[PDB]
Structure 1
Amino acid sequence: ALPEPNIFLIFSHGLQGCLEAQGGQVRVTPACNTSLPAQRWKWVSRNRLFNLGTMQCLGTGWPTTASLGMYECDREALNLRWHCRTLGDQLSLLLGARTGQWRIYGSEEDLCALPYHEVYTIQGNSHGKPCTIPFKYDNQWFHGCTSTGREDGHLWCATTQDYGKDERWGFCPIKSNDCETFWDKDQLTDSCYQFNFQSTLSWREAWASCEQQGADLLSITEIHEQTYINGLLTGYSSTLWIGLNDLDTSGGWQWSDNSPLKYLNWESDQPDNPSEENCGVIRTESSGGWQNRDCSIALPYVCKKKPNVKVECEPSWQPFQGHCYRLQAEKRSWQESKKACLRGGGDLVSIHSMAELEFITKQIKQEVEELWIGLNDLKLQMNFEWSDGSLVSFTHWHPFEPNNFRDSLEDCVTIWGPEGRWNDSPCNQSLPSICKKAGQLT
C-alpha cells in the first residue's frame, strides 16, 4: 500500500523478456508483468539488487561455476555486489539463455537510472543515521520503511542490518502538507519548524534530510522569526545547522530555500574564516546568534516548511512591466539620491525579480559601474527594507556582501558590475542612482 517510485522491471532487449525470480533461481519470462512481485527489483545499499517476490538479493558465487541466485541479504557466503554499469553484461553471461542489452522495462532507460539513496532517520536512538536497507526485524526482511510493530502507524526503519540484535532505529521522513507530530507550528505565520537535537549530520546531509521531508534547512527572514525560534530553543544548549551558506562561489550569503537575506543575526565577530567554514549555525549560547562553520562537521539541524501589461511614461524614463525607470547620473549620497528621486515623483528603485534586475542592469545602469538602489537598514539596523515600502522578496549579493552592517550604523545597498549583484555600503558614498515610479497604462 506504500508507493514504490524506485522499483523497476528489468528487460532484456536480446531475449525479449523480463528478469524473474521464482523457485530458487532467476530466469527471463517473455511475459512481462508490472504487478508480479517476482519481476520487481530495486537497488539497495552495498550495491545489492533486491527482488520483491523472493524478498532476497541477487547473487553469484565467489571465485565453482557461475550461475545466478536469490539469497538472503545477510549472506557473506555469496557475492551480492552488482554495479549498474556492468549489470546487463553480467546477466547475459550468467543467465545461460542462448540466443542483447538490458534496460529498465518500458522506459528503456539504463539500469543506473534509479540508484539507491540514503534516507536519514528522524528522532529515534540513531542520531540521524540513514536507514539500513534492507533490514531484518522480527524475522521478516523490509526493503523500505514500515509501520509494523508500531500501532500509531508511523513509518520507521532500522539503522542496523539486524534490529533484534542492535535495536537501533529511527522514524522515516515524510513529505507532507501538514505539520503533524514532527513539527512545531507557529500560529501566526503557519510556518513549521523541526529541531533535531539528538541528530549529528553534516550540512549537506542535513540539507538532504530536510529535502526528504518536503522542507528546507531553517531560514530566518525577520525579527519575529528569530524571536519565535529563540522561544523554541529555550531550555536547550545546542548548536544547530541552519540554511545560511555562502557555498555558491559566484554569490554572497544566502538561504538555501532562497529566501531574501534581509535580516542578519550574526554574532559580533561573525562571519569569519572566509575560505573554509561555508555554512551557518544558530547557537543558544548567544541566544540565537549565528556563526559560519566548517560544513563537514556533524551537528543537530533545524528544518522549516510552509504549507502554503503595457505601460508608458514621461520622457527620460523607460518602461518595464507597468513601472518606469531612469538613471540619475549625478553622484550623490544615498539619502540625497532618494530626495532627487522623490523630486521626480518616484523613489529609489526596488527590485522584486531577476527579470526586473536584468532590465535595470542592462537597460538602465548600462556602463555605470556602481549605483545606489533602494535597499537599506536606516530604520532598524540589521533589517533591510526598500525605501519605497514594498516587500523584500529576494536578494542578490556579491560574494561576502553584505559586510558593512555592523561597522556602518547606516547601511545602504548598491548594484555593482555587469551581472547586477549587490554590495552594501555606508550611505554617504557618492554614487549615481536609479529611480522607479508607477507607470501609466495605455
Structure 2
Amino acid sequence: TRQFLIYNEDHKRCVDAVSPSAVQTAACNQDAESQKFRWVSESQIMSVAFKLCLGVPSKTDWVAITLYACDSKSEFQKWECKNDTLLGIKGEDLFFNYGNRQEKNIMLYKGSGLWSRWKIYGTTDNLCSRGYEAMYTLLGNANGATCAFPFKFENKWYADCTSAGRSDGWLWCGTTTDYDTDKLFGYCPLKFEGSESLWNKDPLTSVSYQINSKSALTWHQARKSCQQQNAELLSITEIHEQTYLTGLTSSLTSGLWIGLNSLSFNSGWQWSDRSPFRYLNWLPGSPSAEPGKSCVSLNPGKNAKWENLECVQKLGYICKKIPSESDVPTHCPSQWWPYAGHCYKIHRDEKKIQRDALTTCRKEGGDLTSIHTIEELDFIISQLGYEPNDELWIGLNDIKIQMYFEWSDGTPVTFTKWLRGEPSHENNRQEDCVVMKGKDGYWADRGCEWPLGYICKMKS
C-alpha cells in the first residue's frame, strides 16, 4: 500500500534502481523489487531493493540522481512535489528528470517539462499523495516508537517489517536504524498469522478492542496508530461497552487515550470515529473547565471513568474496530411540513415543559423530533422557522437511564451535535432533557421543568 513505482507519463516508463550508482528507467513492472520505492521520512525516498535513499552530490544542474546511505540530516536526499507532478530537490527549482542527451540515468535538471513530472504508477496522483506515513509499533520495548526504515539486523538491511530472528512469524521493525546496536523494536501494525491475538473480540457484539498499555503516545499519534490498523480510538456508546472495557482494563492503572475530545472549537464533546456522544461516564470533576485539556483518557485505576487532559500527554491508548429518485413529494397533514419522508412542526404558541411538549406532539400524531443527520438538522434551522436565538425542546433525554441519552420516539441515537461546552450534565442540576439553541441549531442538555417552544416530527 505504501510502496510505489515512480512513473513518467510521457515516456511510459518507471524508475528502476540498477545499482547504488545506477538509477535508470525500464518498462514498468509492478513485481520488480528494483522498481519499488517508499517514503521513509517526510522528504526521503528509499529504494526497496537496495535499502538506500535517492540523492544527489550537490543541488546543481545536470548531476546524477543515485542511491546513498539514508541520512535524515542530508539536504541532498530531500525531495518535494512542486506544482502538481513536478518532482524536485527540496529548496531548489531543480528536478528529477529522464530523457535528455541520451542519458540513461535519472538526472537532476533545471528543466520543468513533462520529463520532470512523475506519478504513482497505477494512479493519477503525484508522489507526495502517498507521502510518508509513520508506522507506530505495538508492544515491544520502544513504547510505541515508529519504525525506522531501513534498519539493520544481523548486519542485513530491512526495508519493511520482518519476521527474521523469530520463531513465531510476528512482524517487527527496529525503531532506530541500528537494531544490532540499540536493540529497540516493536511489532508492526500489519496482518500476519497470529496478529489478531492483539485484539479482544467482544463475543456479544463482535466488536474488537486493542489495549496498548505499554505505549506512550500523544492523543493524535494514538489516533494515527488506530487509523492505520483500519480502526479508531475507542468510542463508548453503550453501557455494556463500558462494562466490557472496564473488565479488559481492570488490572491497569495508568491512563489510556480514548476517542472522546472537544477539539472542534464550535461544538461540544465528540468521538473521533463520529459516534454519537450519548453515554457519559466522567470522573468526578471532569469534564473540567480548563481550556487546554481537550482530549480524554480512560482511567483504568478509577473504574475506567473518563477525564480530559492535555492532548500532548504521552499515554497508552485503546483502539476499536438534484433530488434522489426516492425524494418524491411528501404528504403531510395541515400545519406540518415535509422533509425526507417525515413531517415537522414548531410549536411557539404556548411554551411547555418538556413532558407536556412531548404529550402535545404525541396527541397530534407525532413526537418530539429526533435528528439523525446534519441535513435534517439543517432543514430545521434553515427552512422550518427556527431563529438563531430560539431555544426549543427536541426528543433527546436521559430520563429512563441516567447518563444514557435516548430519543423519546425510540429510534436509535446515531448522531449528536452538541453546543460548545455541552452536554454539561452538571452534578445535581438534573440536566436530563435537551434543546436546540443558537444560530447553528446545536444541542444542550438542561433541566426539564422549564416552559419552552418545541419541535415535533412524524412519519408522512
Give distance in 2, aligned partners of 1:111 and 1:291. Answer: 41
Shift of 1:89: 1.9
Q: Who is 1:321 aligned against? A: 340
Give distance in 1, aligned partners of 2:28 and 2:410. Answer: 63
Structure 1, residues 104-133: CA drift from partner, whole Å, max 9, x if none? 365564443332221100111111000011
Closer, same or farther in 2 for the Cα pair 1:331/1:123, shift >3 Å? same
Q: Which amino acid aligns with 2:6?
A: L
Say if 1:404 and 1:426, in contact at 8 Å, map to a contact too.
no
Answering whether residue 331 of structure 2 is matched by residue 312 of structure 1, we say yes
Residue of 37, 57, 78 corresponding to 2:53: 57
Residue of 391, 395, 400 corresponding to 1:379: 400
Residue of 392, 403, 410 corresponding to 2:424: 403
Q: Who is 1:296 aligned against? A: 312
Answering whether residue 344 of structure 2 is matched by residue 348 of structure 1, we say no
Structure 1, residues 60-108: CA drift from partner, whole Å, max 9, x if none? 4479x964433343799x8752222433825459838999424236556
Q: Who is 2:94 aligned against? A: 89
Please state whether the residue corresponding to 2:160 is helix, strand or coil: coil
Q: Which amino acid aligns with 1:370?
A: E
Say if 1:191 and 1:304, in contact at 8 Å, map to a contact too.
yes
Residue of 251, 262, 281 corresponding to 1:246: 262
Closer, same or farther in 2 for the Cα pair 1:79/1:184, shift >3 Å? same
Q: Who is 2:279 aligned against? A: 263
Please state whether the residue corresponding to 1:380 is helix, strand or coil: coil
Please state whether the residue corresponding to 1:379 is helix, strand or coil: coil
Answering whether residue 166 of structure 2 is matched by residue 146 of structure 1, we say no
Give distance in 1, aligned partners of 2:292 and 2:143. Answer: 25
Q: Which amino acid aligns with 2:453?
A: P
Shift of 1:405: 4.3
Give distance in 2, aligned partners of 1:227 and 1:35. Answer: 48
Give distance in 2, aligned partners of 1:403 and 1:55. Answer: 54
Closer, same or farther in 2 for the Cα pair 1:80/1:38, shift >3 Å? farther
Closer, same or farther in 2 for the Cα pair 1:232/1:59, shift >3 Å? same
Shift of 1:27: 4.4
Q: Who is 1:192 aligned against? A: 208
Answering whether residue 446 of structure 2 is matched by residue 425 of structure 1, we say yes
Q: Which amino acid aligns with 1:83?
A: W
Answering whether residue 116 of structure 2 is matched by residue 104 of structure 1, we say no
Q: Which amino acid aligns with 2:278?
A: K
Say if 1:365 and 1:434, in contact at 8 Å, map to a contact too.
no
Give distance in 1, aligned partners of 2:425 and 2:380. Answer: 24
Please state whether the residue corresponding to 1:187 is helix, strand or coil: coil
Q: Which amino acid aligns with 1:95?
A: M
Shift of 1:24: 4.2
Shift of 1:342: 2.1
Unaligned runs of 5+ in 2: 82-87, 99-105
Give distance in 1, aligned partners of 2:110 and 2:275. Answer: 59
Unaligned runs of 5+ in 1: none
Q: Which amino acid aligns with 1:327?
A: I
Give distance in 1, aligned partners of 2:142 and 2:168. Answer: 20
Give distance in 2, aligned partners of 1:27 and 1:383. Answer: 62
Answering whether residue 251 of structure 2 is matched by residue 235 of structure 1, we say yes
Q: Which amino acid aligns with 1:103?
A: W
Shift of 1:9: 1.7
Residue of 3, 6, 9 corresponding to 1:9: 6
Q: Which amino acid aligns with 2:77?
A: R
Q: Who is 1:26 aligned against? A: 22
Q: Which amino acid aligns with 1:372?
A: W
Give distance in 2, aligned partners of 1:434 and 1:74. Answer: 63
Give distance in 1, aligned partners of 2:131 and 2:202. Answer: 37
Q: Which amino acid aligns with 2:66?
A: G
Give distance in 2, aligned partners of 1:393 and 1:194. Answer: 23
Q: Who is 1:363 aligned against? A: 383
Say if 1:17 and 1:28, in contact at 8 Å, map to a contact too.
no
Q: Who is 1:438 aligned against? A: 459
Shift of 1:416: 1.2
Shift of 1:31: 4.3
Give distance in 2, aligned partners of 1:43 and 1:384. Answer: 46
Give distance in 2, aligned partners of 1:204 and 1:434. Answer: 38
Say if 2:406 and 2:413, in contact at 8 Å, map to a contact too.
yes
Give distance in 2, aligned partners of 1:370 and 1:280. Answer: 29
Closer, same or farther in 2 for the Cα pair 1:26/1:16, shift >3 Å? farther
Closer, same or farther in 2 for the Cα pair 1:20/1:287, shift >3 Å? same
Residue of 155, 167, 173 corresponding to 2:189: 173
What is the TM-score normalised by the length of structure 1?
0.88
Q: Who is 2:40 aligned against? A: 44
Say if 1:179 and 1:185, in contact at 8 Å, map to a contact too.
no
Q: Which amino acid aligns with 1:334?
A: Q
Q: Which amino acid aligns with 2:310?
A: D
Say if 1:381 and 1:405, in contact at 8 Å, map to a contact too.
no
Q: Who is 1:216 aligned against? A: 232
Q: Which amino acid aligns with 1:388?
A: D
Shift of 1:17: 5.3
Answering whether residue 151 of structure 2 is matched by residue 132 of structure 1, we say no
Say if 1:241 and 1:280, in contact at 8 Å, map to a contact too.
yes
Answering whether residue 435 of structure 2 is matched by residue 414 of structure 1, we say yes
**Could you say what the CA RMSD is over the residues aligned between the two structures, in angstroms?**
3.0
Q: Which amino acid aligns with 1:290?
A: W
Q: Who is 1:161 aligned against? A: 177
Say if 1:120 and 1:129, in contact at 8 Å, map to a contact too.
yes
Closer, same or farther in 2 for the Cα pair 1:98/1:384, shift >3 Å? closer
Shift of 1:360: 2.4
Shift of 1:8: 2.2
Give distance in 2, aligned partners of 1:336 and 1:28. Answer: 78
Closer, same or farther in 2 for the Cα pair 1:405/1:180, shift >3 Å? same
Say if 2:41 and 2:72, in contact at 8 Å, map to a contact too.
no
Say if 1:121 and 1:131, in contact at 8 Å, map to a contact too.
yes
Q: Which amino acid aligns with 1:6?
A: Q
Shift of 1:141: 1.4
Say if 2:42 and 2:131, in contact at 8 Å, map to a contact too.
no
Closer, same or farther in 2 for the Cα pair 1:18/1:187, shift >3 Å? closer
Greater shift after overlay, 279-288 or 199-208? 279-288
Greater shift after overlay, 296-305 or 88-97? 88-97
